[PDB]
């Protein structure tokens, strides 16, 4: 439920929205929040962000060196579980090509969805305060009491005659 500015999954810029409803949006669904929380966590190289030297991933250890596939997978699979709301990891297809020296892995992560605790900070309210009456209706009655009775009588006259 971690709120934050929404990042476009397709381009990487802020998700200002479609041309018909351009604006700014907050990440509300846990899925969207977790997506960008993993994306930033993996995209920032370790130590390259000032104000926090411990954040990021240490790509320099592996890239450019002769490395064992098994060791890399452990670190990749470990960084994911640093988020407190990750249920499990389903599958992991780690493959390496020696000709091009490229490495490419696949996997998915499962996360549940929570409640909103309070709507005070977001948009709307859930209550239905009453509407003041109109004109002399309060002190003298209402005509609808006649209309509903007339309709009931008419529908009952309709019911008895077979159709």
């Amino acid at each position: 439920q971690f709120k934050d500015l929404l990042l476009d999954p397709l381009t990487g810029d802020l998700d200002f929205g479609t041309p018909g409803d351009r604006g700014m949006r907050l990440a509300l669904t846990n899925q969207l929040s977790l997506r960008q929380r993993l994306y930033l966590r993996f995209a920032i190289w370790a130590g390259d962000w000032y104000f926090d030297e411990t954040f990021g991933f240490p790509y320099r250890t592996f890239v450019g060196k002769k490395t064992v596939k098994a060791v890399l997978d452990g670190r990749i699979k470990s960084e994911v579980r640093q988020e407190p709301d990750v249920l499990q990891i389903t599958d992991f297809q780690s493959t390496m090509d020696v000709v091009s020296r490229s490495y490419k892995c696949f996997f998915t992560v499962v996360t549940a969805e929570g409640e909103e605790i309070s709507l005070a900070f977001v948009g709307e309210d859930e209550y239905q305060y009453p509407t003041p009456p109109e004109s002399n209706v309060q002190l003298c009655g209402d005509e609808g009491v006649i209309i509903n009775f007339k309709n009931k009588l008419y529908y009952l006259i309709n019911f008895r005659l077979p159709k």
Binding site: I117, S118, L119, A120, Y127
Partner: protein, 112 residues
């Protein structure tokens, strides 16, 4: 009647919280009970170790809780109010009470 803010409250949401607070150099004990059907907090105020609470009332927003009770030697003379930090239409809830949860329960004391 000049008044200055001097204390703020927070609630953990437990339905039968009870704790002691100090206001205007005097000490009091407070009890908060959650009502299911009426979804509202019931507050009881009394002296430390008192047999029965001195005041019991229902909490609501923008209502002076102590207004009709500033004539007793054991009741604070300040002002106790609940007002929201977010949208003005939000009413007091269970978990939304606190300095940043949405509702600011506050006590303020007159200047003497």
């Amino acid at each position: 009647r000049t008044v200055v803010r001097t204390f703020d409250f927070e609630l953990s949401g437990y339905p039968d919280e009870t704790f002691r607070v100090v206001l205007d150099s005097v000490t009091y004990e407070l009890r908060f009970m959650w009502n299911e059907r009426d979804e509202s907090w019931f507050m009881s105020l009394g002296d430390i170790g008192a047999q029965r609470p001195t005041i019991t009332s229902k909490l609501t927003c923008y209502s002076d809780i102590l207004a009709p009770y500033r004539y007793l030697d054991n009741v604070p003379d300040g002002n106790l109010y609940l007002w929201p930090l977010g949208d003005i239409r939000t009413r007091a809830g269970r978990f939304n009470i606190g300095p940043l949860k949405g509702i600011q329960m506050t006590y303020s004391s007159l200047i003497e």
